[PDB]
Write an enzyme that holds these catalytic residues in place. Structure first.
Site, PDB file in Angstrom:
ATOM      1  N   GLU A  33       0.790  -1.244   0.000  1.00 48.22           N
ATOM      2  CA  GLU A  33       0.000   0.000   0.000  1.00 48.22           C
ATOM      3  C   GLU A  33       0.820   1.292   0.000  1.00 48.22           C
ATOM      4  O   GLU A  33       0.659   2.150   0.873  1.00 48.22           O
ATOM      5  CB  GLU A  33      -0.948  -0.004   1.207  1.00 48.22           C
ATOM      6  CG  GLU A  33      -1.940  -1.166   1.169  1.00 48.22           C
ATOM      7  CD  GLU A  33      -2.827  -1.260   2.403  1.00 48.22           C
ATOM      8  OE1 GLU A  33      -2.403  -0.813   3.495  1.00 48.22           O
ATOM      9  OE2 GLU A  33      -3.954  -1.786   2.270  1.00 48.22           O
ATOM     10  N   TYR A  72      -6.837   4.564   7.051  1.00 49.13           N
ATOM     11  CA  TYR A  72      -5.797   4.768   6.041  1.00 49.13           C
ATOM     12  C   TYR A  72      -5.505   6.251   5.819  1.00 49.13           C
ATOM     13  O   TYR A  72      -6.361   7.106   6.037  1.00 49.13           O
ATOM     14  CB  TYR A  72      -6.211   4.135   4.707  1.00 49.13           C
ATOM     15  CG  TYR A  72      -5.986   2.643   4.599  1.00 49.13           C
ATOM     16  CD1 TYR A  72      -5.746   1.867   5.726  1.00 49.13           C
ATOM     17  CD2 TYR A  72      -6.010   2.011   3.358  1.00 49.13           C
ATOM     18  CE1 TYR A  72      -5.536   0.497   5.621  1.00 49.13           C
ATOM     19  CE2 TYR A  72      -5.787   0.644   3.242  1.00 49.13           C
ATOM     20  CZ  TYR A  72      -5.554  -0.104   4.376  1.00 49.13           C
ATOM     21  OH  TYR A  72      -5.344  -1.456   4.270  1.00 49.13           O
TER      22      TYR A  72
HETATM   23  C1  LIG Z   1      -6.180  -6.502  -1.162  1.00 49.72           C
HETATM   24  C2  LIG Z   1      -6.587  -6.433   0.320  1.00 49.72           C
HETATM   25  O1  LIG Z   1      -7.144  -7.361   0.875  1.00 49.72           O
HETATM   26  N1  LIG Z   1      -6.279  -5.223   1.057  1.00 49.72           N
HETATM   27  C3  LIG Z   1      -6.638  -5.059   2.495  1.00 49.72           C
HETATM   28  C4  LIG Z   1      -5.347  -4.908   3.214  1.00 49.72           C
HETATM   29  C5  LIG Z   1      -4.571  -6.212   3.385  1.00 49.72           C
HETATM   30  O2  LIG Z   1      -5.331  -7.130   4.129  1.00 49.72           O
HETATM   31  C6  LIG Z   1      -3.332  -5.899   4.190  1.00 49.72           C
HETATM   32  O3  LIG Z   1      -2.598  -4.896   3.580  1.00 49.72           O
HETATM   33  C7  LIG Z   1      -2.454  -7.181   4.376  1.00 49.72           C
HETATM   34  O4  LIG Z   1      -1.933  -7.632   3.117  1.00 49.72           O
HETATM   35  O5  LIG Z   1      -5.505  -4.368   4.547  1.00 49.72           O
HETATM   36  C8  LIG Z   1      -6.926  -4.105   5.055  1.00 49.72           C
HETATM   37  O6  LIG Z   1      -7.503  -5.247   5.534  1.00 49.72           O
HETATM   38  C9  LIG Z   1      -6.780  -3.279   6.296  1.00 49.72           C
HETATM   39  O7  LIG Z   1      -5.730  -3.400   7.002  1.00 49.72           O
HETATM   40  O8  LIG Z   1      -7.671  -2.488   6.632  1.00 49.72           O
HETATM   41  C10 LIG Z   1      -7.795  -3.432   3.984  1.00 49.72           C
HETATM   42  C11 LIG Z   1      -7.455  -3.824   2.589  1.00 49.72           C
HETATM   43  O9  LIG Z   1      -8.685  -3.981   1.849  1.00 49.72           O
END
Ligand SMILES: CC(=O)N[C@H]1[C@H]([C@H](O)[C@H](O)CO)O[C@@](O)(C(=O)O)C[C@@H]1O
Ligand SMILES: *[C@@H]1O[C@H](CO)[C@@H](O[C@@H]2O[C@H](CO)[C@@H](O[C@@H]3O[C@H](CO[C@H]4O[C@H](CO[C@H]5O[C@H](CO)[C@@H](O)[C@H](O)[C@@H]5O)[C@@H](O)[C@H](O[C@H]5O[C@H](CO)[C@@H](O)[C@H](O)[C@@H]5O)[C@@H]4O)[C@@H](O)[C@H](O[C@H]4O[C@H](CO)[C@@H](O)[C@H](O)[C@@H]4O[C@H]4O[C@H](CO)[C@@H](O)[C@H](O)[C@@H]4O[C@H]4O[C@H](CO)[C@@H](O)[C@H](O)[C@@H]4O)[C@@H]3O)[C@H](O)[C@H]2NC(C)=O)[C@H](O)[C@H]1NC(C)=O
Ligand SMILES: *[C@@H]1O[C@H](CO)[C@@H](O[C@@H]2O[C@H](CO)[C@@H](O[C@@H]3O[C@H](CO[C@H]4O[C@H](CO[C@H]5O[C@H](CO)[C@@H](O)[C@H](O)[C@@H]5O)[C@@H](O)[C@H](O[C@H]5O[C@H](CO)[C@@H](O)[C@H](O)[C@@H]5O)[C@@H]4O)[C@@H](O)[C@H](O[C@H]4O[C@H](CO)[C@@H](O)[C@H](O)[C@@H]4O[C@H]4O[C@H](CO)[C@@H](O)[C@H](O)[C@@H]4O[C@H]4O[C@H](CO)[C@@H](O)[C@H](O)[C@@H]4O)[C@@H]3O)[C@H](O)[C@H]2NC(C)=O)[C@H](O)[C@H]1NC(C)=O
Ligand SMILES: *[C@@H]1O[C@H](CO)[C@@H](O[C@@H]2O[C@H](CO)[C@@H](O[C@@H]3O[C@H](CO[C@H]4O[C@H](CO[C@H]5O[C@H](CO)[C@@H](O)[C@H](O)[C@@H]5O)[C@@H](O)[C@H](O[C@H]5O[C@H](CO)[C@@H](O)[C@H](O)[C@@H]5O)[C@@H]4O)[C@@H](O)[C@H](O[C@H]4O[C@H](CO)[C@@H](O)[C@H](O)[C@@H]4O[C@H]4O[C@H](CO)[C@@H](O)[C@H](O)[C@@H]4O[C@H]4O[C@H](CO)[C@@H](O)[C@H](O)[C@@H]4O)[C@@H]3O)[C@H](O)[C@H]2NC(C)=O)[C@H](O)[C@H]1NC(C)=O
Ligand SMILES: *[C@@H]1O[C@H](CO)[C@@H](O[C@@H]2O[C@H](CO)[C@@H](O[C@@H]3O[C@H](CO[C@H]4O[C@H](CO[C@H]5O[C@H](CO)[C@@H](O)[C@H](O)[C@@H]5O)[C@@H](O)[C@H](O[C@H]5O[C@H](CO)[C@@H](O)[C@H](O)[C@@H]5O)[C@@H]4O)[C@@H](O)[C@H](O[C@H]4O[C@H](CO)[C@@H](O)[C@H](O)[C@@H]4O[C@H]4O[C@H](CO)[C@@H](O)[C@H](O)[C@@H]4O[C@H]4O[C@H](CO)[C@@H](O)[C@H](O)[C@@H]4O)[C@@H]3O)[C@H](O)[C@H]2NC(C)=O)[C@H](O)[C@H]1NC(C)=O
Ligand SMILES: CC(=O)N[C@H]1[C@H]([C@H](O)[C@H](O)CO)O[C@@](O)(C(=O)O)C[C@@H]1O
Ligand SMILES: CC(=O)N[C@H]1[C@H]([C@H](O)[C@H](O)CO)O[C@@](O)(C(=O)O)C[C@@H]1O
Ligand SMILES: [Ca+2]
Ligand SMILES: [Ca+2]
Ligand SMILES: [Ca+2]
Ligand SMILES: [Ca+2]
Lengths: 388, 388, 388, 388
Positions: free
Chosen positions: B197, B324
């Site tokens: 991210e 975020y």
């Molecule tokens: C593609 C995906 O699932 N992205 C999710 C990521 C991943 O879970 C983390 O970065 C670990 O890889 O983190 C979240 O859950 C979070 O922390 O709020 C939201 C987001 O939608």
């Protein structure tokens, strides 16, 4: 600007990627989303949009009761932005009626809507958002057309119409329009025995349409149109991979010039991309009902009556409802080839889900990739229990 | 028009002023506002817009139940006008999927959406609102990208992707796009040990990204990209002012080339502006959860492992939920320098507020000022009790 | 295009005709209409729009409870098309804050919003929809500005700000902007003793502002600004026709250089057109509360401390609630003179109607006619009982 | 661009085809659709739109109670896209008032709205969306105008106004506008004895208006206007095919220069196309109430007092409610002739359906075809029971 000409071939199709999805029934549970059916997709030189036949009511509105019915005075062809839902506030009406087609010739859009009672229907042809020509019923039995986009070459846009029985010989005509004016029409020729709801695409100055035989056939009729000569031929897809619905199980020998038998007086709108070894066919997974959807790579399906799949992709699981499907392409995209695209109508409500009194749909759409991409599955995603 | 080139430096940051706020959850209590998460902001040459991943339902709709979940077929990247809420009727879909990035190169916008099951996901790259390229998963474990805007220089737009474990070594790639076409990709190099991210900005022909180490680190990894050579380096922010969440308390010595330990297998998307003595870091106020948000001026935070704050600004009180955060800038504004901007996602609902069954967010956004402005605090402002 | 220059005089005002009306509270009883207050009108070269401060909730939404309060993080300056209501789906956010002004200079629009706590507020100046300059509080006591449109001449747009007590001497400044940049500011000079919420218009290269004395006066202060020299003077309207609210009864001698006494620590935003024998003053009909609205033709009201009305027009009956009022003109209309216009805010809800827990408004607007037109009256038109 | 000139004749009318239909009452059962009445259609050079007088409330809103009333401060002329319904979010306000007309001259649109109490009403003339001229009542008894589109030739746009009794001699004036300015007005001349609500169209540099005699006549008055000389004549339609409502049964001899008697003090807005052997008249099917609608081909109806129908088309069944009807044409369409069009207002609610407390309408619109097309019928389609 200039009329589009069909100068390119199809891109190599090695898989399909998600293009659009409007989640209309999910969103319409709590928003002013219009009831629709018979959706499709069509591109302008600067925009691609979703299209469908509205029923003149929202899903949560009390007038949604009875919308399993196909023809009423309250239907219209609407369009709205790609992957948005069709809402009361964002939908643009193209014309009034209960059967339609629409396409852009590079300069302006032609839209055609048919309306009227079963024995006295008429088509109105719009061009650049003005009515230009009209066509009266010639067989007095539900004049009807493609329910997906037409294709234009050098300003000439062919459209397939049918008038007459849905369960016996009917009177099919191919009309050739330019700027909404009728250049010519011809009666159907060739070996197709019944034609409905053609799905078309264009490539290298030829237009190919895959249709629905509602009478005796479970293989699909094909019309091949030369938009320059303004002539056509017709036959069936030769492959034993049958793609109507409902349908018999796949045999080992198909039929090129006659209906493959087993299921009478029914069918569903569908499509194919017929391109030699680059041939892909769409079909429901179920042989009995409109559920599931898959793409199958079937080399030379048009001409080889022994042809079988060598690759495939599931689009909608058999556990989920599908519906009509059709072809479209962005003729104004960059690159040296046209990228094959399609949509699948995801029907919710009646007759299969009769705890509600309405029928509507959402849309999923895919385009081809030269990569070998992983597949997902793409359900409508709405829960019927929420509507009770 | 012309490709934007990164010819300017950052403006001097002496405080932050309010830029945008959409009050989405307040308004969505009684309007058709889409459930979202993972928002960001991105500018076109003539407009700035909010972006987020929709969940394909409104907040008051019954399908909002279960929207704590991150990946579904009903998600899409949407955009809508600055400081309006994301409504069913004003939102524009950019592409379909559950992980995204988007940026304008001066001529047209590139948007990237990833979709699919965990073991078979794929990215579709859109340019000028048409699909242009596709990328299949390479590690078969949730292919994923930035969740905020990318940055372009002379038509070249780098994007950071990760595929593989969220709790151990993963396979991160930097892709370099032009007009949606893949010019080049490289595997991650340098001393960052886990990358998720990334939040990026551009200045004087260099792109700086601040990322999330989800494995062992509570200091943030940094990727520095040369968009002309199409090469990069990576390390961590050296400062003992730790900016992940959750995180340990601030030590007096940070870590430049390895994760600072204490919290495993978690994190949050965040950002920084690394500019020598003009350096500002964002972070949650809480070390335990996503609550509060503050900016801290930490001179030479990137390279000085003893650096501490000399100035700060509270954005969101610790009593209020955050989420975020990410960077963006208006590369088409007037003046001799780029004005640093950022957004903070204000998450409401689950898991922290489980009296409701949904998860959504609103957005607050700030830009830098050369004045020393008074500070306020900027909560989401919705009352959960109203939704019961 | 070019900067507008103030080259014309006022048209002769012989009556007033209806210009716009949005019926916002009527429509908001059953639609997603935003709660607002402090509305105004402002023209672009190609469009005229309504403006107001939103409260970040709809009227029927539960967050409407408590909207009598003036300053919150959930307020923003919004604009929307003339005579439409301010809806969630049609409103454009100009900037975030709880005090505003906005005007078009012929090329682009400048908008200014103030936000923050009472002791630490700040103004952000937007130009061409981008933030350009910021101004910190100088007296640490609710920095505040006009709440109606500013006026520009040859790119220079003066704005009046006040910071400090609402019930004693305060620190008023006139700022001169060009393309959002601060050219100059000056402290208030002249004999006005307290200045709030100035309503301005421009004619023959001069700008005239009619303001609110909230401290001791029930006559209105006037600021006259030379946008070329960037200088100003101030005094009061000399006429014994008093136009603040609340106010004493009209005497026979007014006051030119000091507040007319009787009512302390209150007032309402209002306006006048001061043009010798073509002078018209607006005021509430009630001397006690914000109810009714009338226009009175009072020759030489600015300079004649004996002047009385010779003609009038009722706009809102005393039986109906009014509120703030202000001036605007279409500087881009055809003809050899500028047509004087104004709006009246029609406040509904608290404090006067406390059966509901919200405060909002609708808008009525009029422009001058050289004809002697018949008059109507223009109530908000909503029934409070419907909201219970 | 250029002023439109009326250089073409009417196309041959052999039948009528569906043009537009908005299904407003159906959709408004569950969407934010404004209550309206007195609708019409008018074209711009690049778009055709629906127009109507709003009542300043939605249908489901509680303020819909009492909307049988014709004149209030909450009415406005609105326009919205062809065949969409008039919603709070898609409707554009043209001006404020309770009687209107509007037309495009090829360069810009003129709109006229009348407002005020019965004894003091006034017209405001807007051009290019700015107020330009005003007209005060001259008989102090409900100044009123066409309620459908005006027609322009070389920039000159005639409009018919009436002021005075609805049940005896009144004072009718024809005004000639250019760019919203009054060129000239004249008092009604000729043999028409009472004039209301004229429906106009233009062809070969002449404008023809068909009006409503509300006093003694059940034949329709006709005004023929020369927009170049700015002169007019008037008479009645000579045909014994009577087209007002209510009305006596058709005799065998009509009246050219006096009202045909039988029904006093009532009528309905209607229209005709008077073109020798290409003449078509519209009328309700019922002689007693506003129900049903039909077109009748009546050769030389204007001048032949023995003329009878030779062809017809039912538009709305007698079992369904109709209402006002009027003419419009697309003066900017392609081709060598103008295509005759019309609309029919489909009134729902009070007084005929008093189980609800509101009055509103939807719209159906048709244009002529040179084909002999099959006919349908076009009801409003809403179920009153759903609104209870
Ligand atoms: C593609 C995906 O699932 N992205 C999710 C990521 C991943 O879970 C983390 O970065 C670990 O890889 O983190 C979240 O859950 C979070 O922390 O709020 C939201 C987001 O939608
Ligand atoms: C991540 O995503 C990727 C990408 O999507 C996933 O990979 C995909 O996986 C799917 C599912 O397996 C594949 O779809 C199937 O493809 C096969 C065709 O491929 C096979 O056969 C090829 C041809 O073999 C023949 O010819 C060659 C000559 O060269 C010869 O060598 C061979 O012996 C034989 O003679 C093979 O070439 C091919 O091998 C290649 O690909 C392999 C990967 O698949 C690879 O491992 C190999 O090394 C090689 O490279 C492969 O063996 C289709 O046959 C199949 O479609 C049938 O089955 C589905 C059910 O799954 C059904 O719905 C279809 O309708 C169809 O079956 C019906 O129709 C038949 C035709 O009439 C009939 O014979 C059947 O009995 C059946 O009929 C019944 O059902 C229908 C429908 O209801 C009904 O109408 C009938 O009446 C009757 O009742 C699938 O389409 C993809 O191709 C594949 N894609 C890629 C790029 O790999 C991957 O799985 C994902 N990963 C994870 C972890 O999930
Ligand atoms: C109107 O608005 C204005 C504008 O917003 C308001 O003014 C602002 O007020 C805020 C709040 O006070 C200020 O933010 C804080 O800034 C300080 C830094 O400034 C101080 O320190 C500077 C550096 O001092 C050092 O170096 C110099 C070398 O030159 C040396 O001289 C000095 O002795 C020392 O060695 C000083 O230069 C500075 O002085 C200047 O500014 C003064 C005004 O502030 C002025 O009066 C002076 O004359 C001079 O001009 C000043 O003394 C930050 O330290 C602070 O951030 C810490 O504290 C907050 C809590 O408030 C916390 O959230 C932060 O995270 C941080 O504290 C954590 O991190 C530290 C670093 O690791 C750690 O050491 C702490 O223990 C703490 O750690 C714990 O919490 C965190 C977070 O949960 C956790 O992660 C850890 O693990 C651990 O648990 C604030 O950011 C603004 O700078 C100021 N702005 C301006 C322009 O003035 C004004 O108040 C408003 N008016 C009203 C009436 O409301
Ligand atoms: C159809 O529509 C038309 C158009 O709208 C309607 O016609 C309009 O009707 C209205 C209502 O009557 C008029 O408004 C009033 O105007 C008068 C001023 O006009 C009068 O006075 C003029 C000046 O006279 C003086 O000077 C001349 C010198 O030349 C001298 O000759 C004369 O003797 C005297 O010395 C006259 O020129 C004028 O005559 C002309 O016009 C006549 C038509 O009106 C015509 O017939 C004549 O032939 C000639 O042509 C006329 O006599 C305003 O005074 C009045 O405003 C006061 O009254 C209202 C209440 O109605 C009040 O709300 C106002 O605030 C104001 O009264 C307060 O303020 C005063 C000033 O301090 C104070 O003295 C009062 O005691 C009062 O104070 C109290 O109340 C206030 C408010 O609450 C409070 O603050 C105080 O403390 C205190 O408590 C109206 O504005 C329009 O002018 C007129 N328009 C036209 C074009 O005609 C027509 O009626 C409609 N038709 C129908 C059938 O409905
Ligand atoms: C598919 O769609 C198509 C296309 O829409 C449908 O075809 C259409 O069908 C409709 C319905 O039948 C037709 O409308 C009617 O038209 C007639 C006129 O046509 C007839 O008369 C013509 C003139 O005849 C006279 O002159 C000639 C001189 O040349 C002479 O030869 C003749 O003897 C006579 O002297 C004929 O030319 C014409 O023949 C032609 O057309 C035929 C097809 O129709 C064809 O078969 C022939 O070969 C030839 O080509 C034909 O005979 C209208 O008269 C009629 O309107 C009256 O009736 C309706 C009720 O249906 C009523 O509502 C009207 O208001 C009107 O009747 C009232 O007004 C009269 C005038 O004052 C009065 O005399 C009446 O008593 C009546 O008055 C009462 O009611 C009113 C209203 O409430 C009230 O105000 C009064 O006070 C009083 O109470 C229809 O308009 C279409 O023309 C026709 N179109 C086409 C292209 O064919 C087809 O049916 C559909 N198919 C299916 C399966 O559904
Ligand atoms: C004009 C018309 O009625 N089209 C309808 C067609 C025809 O019934 C069939 O093609 C037989 O002709 O099929 C549908 O019912 C269907 O199968 O879902 C839907 C569609 O609306
Ligand atoms: C910035 C601000 O608070 N403006 C408010 C002002 C000030 O209170 C007064 O002008 C005294 O300074 O007046 C109001 O309350 C009022 O009278 O209706 C509304 C407005 O929102
Ligand atoms: Ca079949
Ligand atoms: Ca971490
Ligand atoms: Ca005061
Ligand atoms: Ca009559």
């Amino acid at each position: 600007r200039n009329f589009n000409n069909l100068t390119k071939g199809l891109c190599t199709i090695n898989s399909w990627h998600i293009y659009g999805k409007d989640n209309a029934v999910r969103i319409g549970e709590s928003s002013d989303v219009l009831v629709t059916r018979e959706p499709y997709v069509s591109c302008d030189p600067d925009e691609c949009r979703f299209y469908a036949l509205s029923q003149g009511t929202t899903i949560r509105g009390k007038h949604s009761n009875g919308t399993i019915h196909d023809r009423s005075q309250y239907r219209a062809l609407i369009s709205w932005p790609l992957s948005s839902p069709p809402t009361v506030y964002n939908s643009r009406v193209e014309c009034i009626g209960w059967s339609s087609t629409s396409c852009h010739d590079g300069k302006s859009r032609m839209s055609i809507c048919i309306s009227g009672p079963n024995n006295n229907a008429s088509a109105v042809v719009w061009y650049n958002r003005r009515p230009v020509a009209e066509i009266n019923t010639w067989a007095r039995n539900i004049l009807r057309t493609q329910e997906s986009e037409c294709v234009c070459h050098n300003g000439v846009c062919p459209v397939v119409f049918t008038d007459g029985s849905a369960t016996g010989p009917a009177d099919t005509r191919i009309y050739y329009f330019k700027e909404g004016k009728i250049l010519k029409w011809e009666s159907l020729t060739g070996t197709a025995k019944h034609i409905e709801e053609c799905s078309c695409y264009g490539e290298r100055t030829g237009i190919t349409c895959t249709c629905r035989d509602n009478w005796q056939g479970s293989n699909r009729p094909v019309i091949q149109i030369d938009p320059v000569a303004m002539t056509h031929t017709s036959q069936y897809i030769c492959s034993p991979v049958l793609t109507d619905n409902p349908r018999p199980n796949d045999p080992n020998i198909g039929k090129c010039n006659d209906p493959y038998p087993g299921n009478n007086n029914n069918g569903v709108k569908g499509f194919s991309y017929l391109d030699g070894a680059n041939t892909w066919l769409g079909r429901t997974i179920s042989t009995a009902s409109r559920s599931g959807y898959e793409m199958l790579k079937v080399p030379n399906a048009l001409t080889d009556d022994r042809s079988k799949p060598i690759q495939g992709q599931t689009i909608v699981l058999n556990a989920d409802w599908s519906g009509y499907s059709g072809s479209f392409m962005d003729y104004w995209a960059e690159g040296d080839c046209y990228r094959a695209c399609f949509y699948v109508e995801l029907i919710r409500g009646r007759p299969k889900e009769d705890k509600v009194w309405w029928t509507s749909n959402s849309i999923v759409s895919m385009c081809s990739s030269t990569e070998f991409l992983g597949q997902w599955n793409w359900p409508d995603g709405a829960k019927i229990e929420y509507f009770l």
